[PDB]
């Protein structure tokens, strides 16, 4: 019993951490075989980042401008070339602690493992999900960039994200694996902004469903609804509108508690509506949005407390 | 900038949980350098669990009633003996991933990661507090027994935590690693429970600082208050009371804000009163009591946003 925000154990990625160095500017990068990446803008002076060109910021760079520090050992630079916002390494050692991997872009609403770093060294990890804007709500200092989100499945780690960046709102915009950027926002200076943010509902409802496997159906009621009236409400709530594709994610959660995913929906009405009377499920006061139906039958008993 | 419940990373601890059977019965174990320590309840069947004599259960074991798997890898057990309510297997191989550690007691208050494990293998990280009744309000499921707590300060594992029980109301309760229950608990059937708890007032008065450093004062006031116009007004709220040597400990958050201790209570006082009149900090609803003094330096920026 007992419900967590869990993260991934972060072994397999600590063991891929290091440190790069540009002139005075040093962020962490990811040594798996072969290859480093970290972000573009270590190639920046402060100054740069208020309008690089990044192509003639990187011409200008030898192989032996950058310093990459895996733990006490210098590993040599033997090539580089830009990917879109990264900016990959080629040295001349493959990194013996490589994991199976992937590199995956995560949508909306999924949720991934966050290990913050600072000069190549892991200091801490949290689960994180991608708000609907493609923000994250992080905890990063100065030093972080380069820092990664992940999953892990059977051994292989689902690499999906690397930090580059701080909004003004204190929420954090970063990249895929390949340096594209999640949402809007550019590795340059401008006046980008965090746009306006949603509850993901899909999330809620999982999180209804957690409750009840582990033995709560205070909120439940008698009542059912259409999906067009949930999402008149939903509308009012600044609520996700759910869709039929939502519905049917959340079978196998309906299946196991025996609640219909509309009538979890009429639960769900009447909690916006009415609020929760001093109430609370799994420990909380309000409706939590950062767990995925994945996040739930990963944590939950797959037997029901009835 | 942010604030999250972070896990220290997990890599030291996980090169080191096996699993261990005796008979029908597995659960985790934790290998540091020969030994193998885990719950003693390993020796027990289901009935045994009703009135066990740990000490006649044991001397009707050999070394070979004892498998230890590592991996893939069998380890020979070579010697037992119980430490409380602990298991130490001696076995034929020292752990090659042994890290620097420490084997330490946490008090009540304190906090500490949790790598839940089933089977040997790791599954997730999170952060707990000790709470003043001496339980954890883990995420826990059948197979868990054995998985470890912990704090990492500069390379070494400080180990404070191995998983034995769920209590009736879904909290958790074990020993420290020398096999000493926290609190009152046994490891036999009887009608125990967690006992009342209070709200750790030490940690909330630390998150409120971290919620100044991270730029937000709305919850500041003109007020002060002595410790015992502050205490009165605890006890109404199920708080712990505040003592002088929980004021010296506030220093250093103190003065990187240059906000006194018992101004803060006097805010404390003012936001138990009040409420929070549908206002967050740092993204709560609720006044947070799961970081200490240490956790708030520990993640918050040492620059004030003034
Ligand atoms: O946001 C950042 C870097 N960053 N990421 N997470 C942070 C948490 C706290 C503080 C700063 C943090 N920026 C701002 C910028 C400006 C244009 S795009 C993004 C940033 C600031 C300075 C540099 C820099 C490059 N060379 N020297 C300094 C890079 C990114
Ligand atoms: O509580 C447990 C073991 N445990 N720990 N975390 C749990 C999370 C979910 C389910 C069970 C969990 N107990 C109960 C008991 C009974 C007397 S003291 C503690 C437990 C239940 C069964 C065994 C057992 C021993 N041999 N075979 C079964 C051990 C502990």
Redesign the interface.
């Known amino acids: 019993?007992?419900?967590?925000?869990?993260?991934?154990?972060?072994?397999?990625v600590?063991?891929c951490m290091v440190q790069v160095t540009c002139g005075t500017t040093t962020l962490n990068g990811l040594w798996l075989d072969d290859t480093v990446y970290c972000p573009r803008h270590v190639i920046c002076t402060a100054e740069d980042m208020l309008n690089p060109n990044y192509e003639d910021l990187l011409i200008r760079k030898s192989n032996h401008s950058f310093l990459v520090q895996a733990g006490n050992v210098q590993l040599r630079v033997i090539g580089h070339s830009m990917q879109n916002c990264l900016l990959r390494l080629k040295v001349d050692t493959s990194n013996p602690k490589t994991p199976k991997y992937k590199f995956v872009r995560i949508q909306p609403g999924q949720t991934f493992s966050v290990?913050?770093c600072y000069n190549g060294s892991?200091?801490?990890?949290?689960q994180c999900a991608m708000r609907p804007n493609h923000t994250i709500?992080?905890?990063?200092?100065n030093g972080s960039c380069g820092s990664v989100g992940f999953n892990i499945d059977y051994d292989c780690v689902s690499f999906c994200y690397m930090h580059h960046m701080?909004l003004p709102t204190?929420?954090?915009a970063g990249t895929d694996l390949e340096g594209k950027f999640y949402g809007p926002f550019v590795d340059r200076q401008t006046a980008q902004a965090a746009g306006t943010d949603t509850t993901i509902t899909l999330n809620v409802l999982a999180w209804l469903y957690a409750a009840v496997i582990?033995g709560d159906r205070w909120f439940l009621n008698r009542f059912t609804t259409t999906l067009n009236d949930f999402n008149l409400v939903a509308m009012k709530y600044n609520y996700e509108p759910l869709t039929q594709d939502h519905v049917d994610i959340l079978g196998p959660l309906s299946a196991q508690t025996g609640i219909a995913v509309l009538d979890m929906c009429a639960a769900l009405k009447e909690l916006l509506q009415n609020g929760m009377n001093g109430r609370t499920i799994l420990?909380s006061?309000?409706l939590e949005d950062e767990f995925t139906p994945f996040d739930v039958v990963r944590?939950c008993?797959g037997v029901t407390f009835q």
Chains 1, 2 share one sequence.
Do not use: D
Request: aromatic content about 12%.
């Open positions: 019993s007992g419900f967590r925000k869990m993260a991934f154990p972060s072994g397999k600590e063991g290990l913050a892991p200091s801490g990890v949290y709500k992080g905890s990063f200092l701080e204190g929420v954090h582990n420990g006061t309000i944590q008993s």
